[PDB]
Design a protein around this nucleic acid. Sequence first.
RNA 1: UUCACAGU
RNA 2: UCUGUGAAA
Length: 803
Amino acid sequence: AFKPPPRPDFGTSGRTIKLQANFFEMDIPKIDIYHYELDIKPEKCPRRVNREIVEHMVQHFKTQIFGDRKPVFDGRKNLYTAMPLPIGRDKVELEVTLPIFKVSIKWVSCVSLQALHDALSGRLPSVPFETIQALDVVMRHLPSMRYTPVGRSFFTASENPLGGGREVWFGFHQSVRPSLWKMMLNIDVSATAFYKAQPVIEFVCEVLDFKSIEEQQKPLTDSQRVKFTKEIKGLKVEITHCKRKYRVCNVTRRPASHQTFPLQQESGQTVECTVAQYFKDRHKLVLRYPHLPCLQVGQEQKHTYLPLEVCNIVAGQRCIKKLTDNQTSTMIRATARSAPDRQEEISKLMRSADFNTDPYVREFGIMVKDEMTDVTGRVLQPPSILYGGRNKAIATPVQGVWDMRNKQFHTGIEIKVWAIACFAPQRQCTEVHLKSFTEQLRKISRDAGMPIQGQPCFCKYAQGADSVEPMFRHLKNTYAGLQLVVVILPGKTPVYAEVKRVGDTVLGMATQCVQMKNVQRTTPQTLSNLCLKINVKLGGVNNILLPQGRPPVFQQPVIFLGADVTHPPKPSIAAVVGSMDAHPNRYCATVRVQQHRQEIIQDLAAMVRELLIQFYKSTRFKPTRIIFYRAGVSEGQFQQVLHHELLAIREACIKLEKDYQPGITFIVVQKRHHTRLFCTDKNERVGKSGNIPAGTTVDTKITHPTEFDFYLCSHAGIQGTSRPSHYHVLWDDNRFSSDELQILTYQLCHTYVRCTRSVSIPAPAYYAHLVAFRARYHLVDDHQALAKAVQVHQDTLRTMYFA
RNA sequence: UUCACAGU
RNA sequence: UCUGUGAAA
């Protein structure tokens, strides 16, 4: 429970496919970096001014200390140098005057790049983290000051108007990653909304829709002024009549020709003076547009007013405000390019890159290749999908997609008793709408092998979440064992949360919500997917993996776990699900409420205990193996999460029986990264987005130099560029081969019951996500109060309500 | 709240 | 959480 296993071997399954990865080979020396800690006071100033302070500190004491060395800075306390500094362990104290700060700097440690080279080779088993971090600081130093940092991406002005004084800025993500033999620089592109570096007058011309400012010869109306105010308030501006930056707190009601302030004269006496007057006398600036209001800057009652024609919107402030759908449309154009388009963008960026010409990068003897890394991937064979009925039809996924035509559920549920609760206006969702929807739904359901062989025994209109529980209870007594309540919803509303709370937690009634728009106008696809959900919620089995096509791990009892934690931007929600049959199709769910933004699953031992117990209840077997798919953890959390959670799983096992120790395979699933894969050959591109084919597997060249990880793109890219899921094996008692684990994961991506498609992550993980989200919906109304708020009814525990 | 994918 | 695309020829 300490060190992740080494890669057992390399996969050879599937067919080869030529790929390009947005990893760029790095040339890294074997010298020793010197790591110093900086303690600068005052310590609460922003990062970029820290970088300015450090920079001036460096170029000031050149004769004395730093000399020819160009140190890099992470923006906080960490400094790195290629050559040693005239330093000891003792903190040396300096003072730097910025156009005054104390700067304490001491020697921390030597960072060996030789040991890193060893880690890339077969010399060392582990990759030293502070080497990677140091390298990252080296590569990020200059672009942190030259560009505008958003998150860990660097953004800049294009060469892209958005309207409303807003524009698209283009940026790139950059990160140093360890790979086999060589270090890699992962680069991706992105775009976001910024405010233009234009004069405030141009800004009002764009916000108030003026071609020329001469359009408004008269003062602004209250409406105009209010819109402009709510658009510019909070934004920083800079003056052009001296320089100084100000933050706008309000816009004056009065125009500059009438807005007054208490002018403090040389005598010490105050006299009320208009802004226009002051700018005419003091700055000899006759305002060309005195009929416009002023920007109130500074704070509160300091009466600092700036006329519009002397202010510019400062560059580098991203627009977080929601945008117009036109602006959002062009935004979509920019941010979600097709795979070849993104490929070409990255390629262009790196063919015109600044890394090799960066003085700080060259100081540490680093070089970066211009071309993407050529990688050979493997497209895995998709599993066949077995259905039921008399035909027992078998579907073959083509490009990660199949359908239900001429196919019936492996185990369809006969729906005898069901009701309809319409929370939409009757005059808007009429009776004939409900009737037509009903007969069409019955047609589709009968075709799918889930026969709704009768009209609803109940069908009423309603309004108010407060009406949900009294009705549902009424439905629970009036009608002997209904199976389903279909609830029609008029868009986003609290009654959905209430319906799920009442149905799942307090009564144990299966409920299926349908939005109003999908009742008025229905499509066979929508009805079919709806039937997938309904059949699953009633205990049915939509389909199974072809038994003979399963990997040999299924020759012995095995449980598949999925785990996820969702956090508030207010407790965190942990969810763990587990397989309950050998197909594997049906899953049981457990969920806990826990500490605010705690990523470690606190009550994992108990949850796993419950799941194992339920597994034995369902299969009459104890699992010989436990496959644990953990979602949403970063590498920085790997050791902690692995430690506590693997100990928790083993704890559950040993607290169930004395000598019961099944093999545990701990696998982290991550969809949030910047790895992009492209088809080298144009004829391998799939669809209009031109993405790699579903089942594309990569476990070479860009993966970890020693540990057991791989990329799997199991889904078909519909729009933009696909995001291949990454899998990192933190533990493996079962000694999986790469092929078997990759194939297993891929097949598990075909067991997701809400669609006849291969999804991006294995069904366990996805289900865990769904469970956590549902729990979030259960908490809409004390720690243990919240705990029993997410605890489902007894008649729900053995169900797949989260579907 | 038919669903998946993709952006933030 | 929102936003977008997709389930013509």
